[PDB]
């Protein structure tokens, strides 16, 4: 109690990544497998990454995207490179998305905080966003996980913005 005020902080973060991430799952009975799944992953319980992972690529409704970010935020806190993740992490229905996305990653390297990284990464597209997820996607200790989890708001922002 004494203890768990201290953490609101980290927790709060978590609620907020939780939160965007589920504005863009579809409102289908899928849908609370996915929020039971982020909630035992963000309260520390033991998962295999594989197994999340071969669920998520074999889940229909889903979107390319939305598994390539579900993707991405279970790799970033369940202690390799998955192809459908990889592949649907992309702008590319828009060539100036990649010149983006690199300039996005530049500045994102310089971030420390989670608001910061947030705060840059709303000056960019949804599909600029998700190019940026990709090149980090590939190099996941070029940010910080606070840094990532902005950019993973950030873009579930922007798609939740355009439908």
Not at 74 to 84: C, D, E, G
Not at 141 to 154: H, Q
Request: glycine content about 8%; proline content about 4%.
């Amino acid at each position: 109690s004494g203890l768990e005020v201290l953490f609101q902080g980290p927790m709060s973060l978590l609620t907020e990544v939780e939160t965007y991430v589920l504005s863009i799952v579809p409102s289908a009975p899928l849908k609370a497998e996915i929020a039971q799944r982020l909630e035992d992953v963000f309260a520390g319980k033991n998962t295999d990454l594989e197994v999340l992972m071969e669920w998520l690529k074999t889940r229909p409704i889903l979107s390319p995207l939305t598994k390539g970010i579900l993707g991405f935020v279970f790799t970033l806190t369940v202690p390799q490179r998955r192809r459908f993740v990889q592949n649907a992490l992309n702008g590319n229905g828009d060539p100036n998305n990649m010149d983006k996305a690199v300039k996005l990653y530049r500045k994102l390297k310089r971030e420390i905080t989670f608001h910061g990284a947030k705060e840059i990464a709303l000056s960019y597209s949804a599909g600029a966003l998700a190019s940026c997820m990709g090149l980090i996607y590939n190099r996941m200790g070029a940010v910080t996980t606070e840094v990532a989890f902005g950019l993973v708001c950030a873009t579930c922002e922007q798609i939740a913005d355009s439908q």
